[PDB]
Write a protein that binds this ligand. Structure first.
Ligand code: ZN
Length: 28
C-alpha cells in the first residue's frame, strides 16, 4: 500500500502522523 495504514483498523493514510493521530482512538 503506497500510503500507510491504520495497522489496526484496516484503513489507509499517506500521513504517518495522521494515522498515528488516529490511534488516539485505540485508547480506553
Ligand atoms: Zn485504528
Amino acid at each position: 500500500m503506497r500510503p500507510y495504514s491504520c495497522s489496526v483498523c484496516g484503513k489507509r493514510f499517506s500521513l504517518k502522523h495522521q494515522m498515528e493521530t488516529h490511534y488516539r482512538v485505540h485508547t480506553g
